[PDB]
Design a protein around this ligand. Structure first.
Ligand SMILES: C[C@H](CCC(=O)O)[C@H]1CC[C@H]2[C@@H]3CC[C@@H]4C[C@H](O)CC[C@]4(C)[C@H]3C[C@H](O)[C@]12C
Ligand SMILES: C[C@H](CCC(=O)O)[C@H]1CC[C@H]2[C@@H]3CC[C@@H]4C[C@H](O)CC[C@]4(C)[C@H]3C[C@H](O)[C@]12C
Ligand SMILES: C[C@H](CCC(=O)O)[C@H]1CC[C@H]2[C@@H]3CC[C@@H]4C[C@H](O)CC[C@]4(C)[C@H]3C[C@H](O)[C@]12C
Ligand SMILES: C[C@H](CCC(=O)O)[C@H]1CC[C@H]2[C@@H]3CC[C@@H]4C[C@H](O)CC[C@]4(C)[C@H]3C[C@H](O)[C@]12C
Ligand SMILES: C[C@H](CCC(=O)O)[C@H]1CC[C@H]2[C@@H]3CC[C@@H]4C[C@H](O)CC[C@]4(C)[C@H]3C[C@H](O)[C@]12C
Lengths: 477, 477, 477, 477
């Protein structure tokens, strides 16, 4: 019997009284593991209202006390890490080891964010007026909402709530209807440690219903959403009605540039890891490789073996695999279609390229060759273990092609040449550029994508300041 | 014969070939002073494309060289200050002295922004990985657009372009169709000093046409618009289609709090100045006064005389007036209606309250009494010399009422009590709080409004950073 | 039998082989509680050399790993807090409750400093040269030394070592020969948790011997010393020989200004607390009070009762006292002499003013009246529970007199008037100004005294940066 | 007839009444060009007192107004640039072109520093106490003194006074007795533009007399001195008596590392330029070269020709030379001795190595080979056009040897390898590291040397903050 999850509103779990439910299916077995309410905008309003009530008294607390609350939550996470991990594996369909780190990192991330308590600073600005003091304070926005993705559902709860709460905001989070269980568990921890009512709220439902309310409710100061570009378009358009601030993370088509002088083994590992992780279902995954011709042959051959070596299976039954299934049937069909589009445009399927037909949504690691920069596969985000490769002559070309995208979240380049590195740094129009290593953001970095990849960012000091606004005081006395 | 202005695109003035024109009328005499093209989206695209072409080579220039270009423009402004001022007075209908400062301040503002060249810093972040360097660079967004207002048309050209160009962005500006002449003059200066083609572009037309293109063109990194809330809604909604970043300044209903222990003379002057300036046509104008009961009588009487003393006339024919006419007929009718709405709701018209019937759009300073916090006049932005006054008992009430608004740009309070001041600072949910002085932002402050007052901000370091984005480089080597 | 303490050098406790020892006497009972080696410069060199060897590999560790080491130490402190407290009480002669907070705060302070790991930032500066990158890195100084005081011996170990180690420096600490036991205990914890050898070293001895070496050894990057002005003079003079950086905290004569409109009860409590704490043996203690005439009478009377109510005794035998004995006989005699000097100059002894004759070094709370600004008692730091009071007319006078000092560490003022506050803030030439509260620095503040009070500072971000230096890299490639 | 210069004290030039004078001799012709007073400590006190009187009212001025004063001075410099240049050439003995840039850069430097007016920020720190505000203000130190060097006498006036005055400090400057004329000219400009009396003061005399007073006068907040290490030792030791803050720039032995993969032509030019500039009389001059063996031969040969091509002469009579004479006879003899010491230790004199015997103090460019790392010539600063070269095997060795010095101001390395660069950056313990370019600091960088090279620094934001201190306000209200 799959559990029927309640939403968490105003400091308590509230059982759903509606008739409609959303089935949460295991992407590996297609079994229904649980059901969440097919929430309505009304449910989002209640949470938003509770969030609004709590905000004043929450921001009035000294920052160190808000931090203290965050630490109780992280400690709560660690005590149930294995259990949380298992939930991620089940509904997310990600490999055990990855679920384990997500959970562990989430707790550390929260603890790290809590350390900002006594550190985000306001400023005292010199005035041209004698006897005047210009004090610029950093204040909370108020009520914030978070629309989470399914690829890293647990971490993203923290990615948004930790910085939000620390700075004195309250939040109403909507997890992805595909992966709500880990969120329910996060709520249980929040409830158990007694976090003040209304500071953290979890509503459940679809994006067109619950999500939209979290972006269109006039009481919301900022809606932080992570999802598809089109979804971000719908979210920002809605947030526009009330001039609501948006913080968007909409994916990418992260290019990887391999120079002739690249540490070939290093590059192949970084790229494969960066591409095969979570079955390529990450916004900063290496989605397109540019290999300089001089090294194309040996590199593509090495890259080919590596990927062909990537094993995939049911994460709950194997800990020797690198990939689990894709999130759902639609996702699988989406990947198959894009690969077909690639073939149709003239691309060559080295290995893989055919979705497994059977229980679950598995897609084999895929290497696409004879790809031309103009091919859709090089522009549209795949979100699957598919890797197209294009050869280039000069750095200028690689840079030019890497920049030829509506996405600008992550980029990577492997070289040992100083000038090439500096030129790539300067030329690459991306929010992130990894040099001689895999695409894994640090919690103290700034994961903010250029162009359509998003607006605003997450992590680090700047992620923290996304939840802070200013009050310039002109004191004359 | 009114001059037919050409747009400034890709380093040159381009004569309009369309048949439709927009008349630019003098708000004081209703005479047509000039005509601008009824530009189309196509015209905005050409400018945007030119802006895109120039951007790479513009950002490649050392910051100090971009600054050098800004200084040539400011110097250009000063050489023609009187002429520019006259244009502002004519089309803007603002008093000579105010036009003079706008022009003078604009030049200083540009020079000030240019000084950021060698100062906006990137960051070197500690990494948890041995041998890794985390370099966070500040980069330009690329192509930015600016939709300017008519109240301070000249300054706002600089408010957006100076920080934009300094940081390496290129810009396409659309002035308000009501006040384009000063913008044309700004373009002439830009053209005369030889600013690289495509870095600064001026397109002319309506907001639903030209404005929309500047917000919806996919090549635009960020659209910076200053106008009405509803206009901001339309702009952000459009910018949403391409996940374009928005920087919005949409007005306010700036509350002014007068405590019993306030320097009465100081408060009356600050508020009147802050309210009557530009005929109350400023977003940070004192739009609603809260006077503690103990001082209500003497204060309201003093305030009454002050405002009644405010003279208004045709700015081109008098330099002894404090106000000019409102921007246009619609604006006038809007103010009359809101005052009527006030009366209808129970408000009392002390003095003024009746638009002059005749050539021009003049509205007398107006004091509204017997106002209740729930009255529309206390929520809807007036943008006219109308001043409603509400009495209150405690600070808590004044704060509560001040915060009771969809606008949160500016706020002010007059007191001599430490605790009252600190409590007001902490309690006031505004981007700006003036204490014992008039509402005039410093160029080194941060004019960023809360709630519907806007998104992002202008001026100072933070205004400058609105035009900067980040590139986090994870260097391993 | 008093324990003979060994020094802690290069990761291990080393037994003293010399013949001379320093007796550590209980300031309350005059009993010998322990003995430490009468260390020689040679002993300081060994520690410095070990510190130098370890530095490279210590700074090579990721900051988060150094932080991890700090946290092990703080956790170690907490597990033995009661025991550490008891040692402080015994050798320091401070009241149990104060020893308890010192220990508790020390651990929190260390944990707080460890949180800077991923936060101290370098900077990327814009260059006037095309293709150039200016990278300003923050690096450790190298080997640093710390000469600790006896008033807050335990906390100061952390005040210097935590920020030092986090930033990648190694340190050689010399506790005060009067209070080394708590330091030995800190070393035991460091040793037990396995902190890399040479990173933390504890040498024992006198200042003219061991202390001098820690300031004059050419391998020392910076000597951080907290003590008497004359001692600081000797330390800086020595550090001069090798152009060694100094961070000095040399005490103060913290003035307290009470305005007529001050919350009298609040002021009396703040001042007494700030003065009687640790028997007035703190650099930021209220050492001189300026009371506006209008409130002089009632205030001085209230202040008098409060102080007369302050009980003092043997901290190990009573937890109902506010003060313990002074550090030693010399200290006691110093206070008696200064009070006598006060009387001789014309001062009036309200209450107290006579050192108890007997076992221990107790001095009663003392209130001095009929004091003139020029009296020595108003300039020379007392470091005893003696409180001189001077009446003044205007704020200007209070400010002027407060500033009339070679010390400029801490200052305080009690008022409810905005202007008085702002004028005091602006006029007071001090590193710290408390307004309507007692003089207790926050760990996130910046305890850095002006004038002779010191050079550099402690605590917060700026305290942390005292242990960091810069490396500006001009990269052309 | 050589002019007898007066000192500039308290807003006016004061004629010397003493009997003793110091002859200012032209290093190229040995002719007496002028005479300055053999000032006494008393003269320094008068200036310091005037500086103290003016300080309060100077700091009370809005920062932008202080900046305005700086700009008047820079503009004054430019109007007399040629004349100032000529003076530098005459007394400094530097080539016309270098004197010209010094003057031009000085003016730009001052203008740049003035731009900090509205930019140095204080901070608002979060407190653990409810209702408390922690405001950290940046205040001036008060009275500061500057002991200038003779190598870049004009620039250093600005390097110290510009940041000092902008932040609200007043200053008393002592130029080098060898090069006071340019300082007198700077004073004339200051006097002509009407800078408030006492804000800028110029005293003349020797270091043991006037200099010492500027470091030992108890009214001095900070003494900023640039000179020899031993002089810095005497200055800091003196400043110690009153716990006066010191900012010292004491020279260097800047190492240059040439890797096998270095752009040989680029490296030879950078190093020669960096070494031959001002006849090698600069603290950041390349003073020792480390060439990897693989490229040693071709590099040393190229380097040899380059240096042999460096022409030197009387700067007033030739504009085709790269070097002028050394500052004075003692300097010349010092260089000859050090070269002899090199030869005696086993070094080989490729070319030059023999001071010209005749009118003036000329020393030919000198290349020393067969140098061993332990040779004095590789440790003692030469301050002459002498260049020792050592061969090395690995980067590790070059780094190790570069770090083997009491000086740590500047360092440089030429390579095209990413890892080598990053390793050099990380390994080089210097305040500056130039990569593939000559050693010329940017005004927005931070010229602060490690180890004995100095304490504190100059230029940029951090140079500016050397003249700023903090006042942490704990506001409770
Ligand atoms: C086709 C059935 C499923 C439905 C049926 O009973 O017919 C079986 C037979 C082949 C099976 C696959 C074999 C390769 C993989 C082994 C992994 O360790 C788990 C996932 C995969 C992808 C398996 C998934 C599923 O277990 C399949 C597809
Ligand atoms: C009504 C005519 C205009 C049209 C006509 O010819 O009838 C005149 C008569 C009264 C005039 C007003 C008198 C008061 C004001 C004097 C100011 O110095 C200019 C603006 C005002 C508000 C004038 C505007 C205009 O000049 C009016 C309104
Ligand atoms: C109306 C008189 C002027 C005419 C007269 O002499 O009566 C006064 C009253 C209020 C004055 C304004 C106050 C705010 C501004 C102060 C600026 O530093 C200069 C421009 C402004 C905009 C002033 C312009 C002018 O000085 C006004 C409008
Ligand atoms: C004088 C003897 C000590 C020596 C002797 O045996 O004569 C006794 C008698 C009076 C004693 C004091 C009484 C007042 C205090 C009581 C406190 O709870 C502990 C400290 C004090 C200050 C005591 C210290 C010491 O215990 C004294 C001074
Ligand atoms: C030796 C006399 C000077 C004294 C005398 O009359 O004997 C002359 C003869 C050789 C002369 C030198 C020749 C080479 C250089 C030519 C430069 O353009 C100026 C500096 C030098 C270094 C000259 C300096 C001086 O002019 C010298 C040394």
């Amino acid at each position: 019997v799959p559990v029927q999850h309640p939403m968490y509103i105003d400091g308590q779990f509230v059982t759903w009284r509606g008739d409609a439910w959303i089935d949460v299916v295991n992407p590996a077995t297609e079994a229904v593991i649980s059901r969440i309410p097919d929430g309505q905008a009304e449910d989002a309003r209640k949470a938003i209202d509770a969030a609004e009530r709590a905000q004043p008294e929450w921001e009035a607390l000294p920052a160190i006390e808000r931090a203290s609350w965050l630490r109780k939550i992280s400690a709560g996470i660690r005590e149930r890490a294995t259990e949380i991990s298992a939930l991620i594996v089940e509904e997310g369909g990600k490999i055990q080891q990855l679920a384990e780190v997500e959970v562990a990192f989430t707790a550390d991330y929260i603890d790290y964010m809590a350390e900002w308590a006594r550190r985000y600073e306001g400023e005292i600005i010199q005035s041209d007026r004698p006897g005047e003091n210009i004090l610029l304070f950093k204040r909370a926005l108020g009520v914030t909402t978070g629309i989470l993705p399914w690829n890293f559902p647990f971490f993203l709860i923290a990615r948004k709530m930790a910085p939000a709460l620390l700075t004195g905001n309250t939040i109403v989070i909507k997890p992805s209807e595909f992966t709500p269980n880990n969120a329910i568990a996060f709520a249980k921890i929040v409830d158990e440690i007694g976090l003040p009512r209304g500071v953290f709220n979890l509503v459940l439902g679809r994006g067109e219903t619950v999500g939209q309310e979290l972006a269109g409710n006039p009481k919301v100061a900022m809606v932080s959403m992570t999802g598809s570009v089109s979804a971000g378009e719908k979210i920002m358009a809605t947030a526009a009605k009330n001039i609501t601030k948006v913080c968007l993370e909409l994916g990418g088509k992260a290019p990887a540039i391999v120079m002739d002088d690249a540490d070939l083994e290093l590059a192949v590992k970084a790229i494969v890891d960066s591409r095969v992780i979570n079955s390529g279902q990450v916004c900063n995954c290496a989605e397109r490789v540019y290999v300089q011709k001089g090294i194309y042959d040996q590199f593509v051959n090495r890259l080919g073996e590596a990927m062909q070596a990537v094993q995939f299976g049911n994460p709950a039954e194997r800990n020797d695999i690198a990939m689990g299934p894709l999130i759902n049937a639609a996702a699988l069909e989406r990947v198959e279609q894009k690969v077909a589009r690639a073939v149709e445009e003239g691309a060559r399927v080295a290995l893989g390229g055919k979705a497994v037909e059977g229980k679950g949504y598995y897609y084999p690691p895929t290497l696409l060759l004879d790809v031309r920069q103009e091919m859709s596969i090089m522009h549209e985000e795949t979100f699957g273990p598919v890797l197209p490769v294009v050869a280039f002559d000069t750095l200028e070309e690689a840079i030019s092609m890497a920049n030829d995208s509506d996405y600008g979240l992550t980029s990577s380049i492997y070289t040992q040449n100083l000038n090439v590195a500096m030129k790539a740094i300067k030329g690459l129009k991306f929010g992130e550029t990894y040099i001689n290593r895999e695409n894994f953001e640090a919690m103290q970095g700034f994961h903010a994508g250029w162009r359509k990849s998003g607006i605003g960012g997450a992590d680090g000091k700047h992620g923290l300041h996304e939840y802070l606004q200013t009050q310039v005081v002109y004191l004359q006395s």
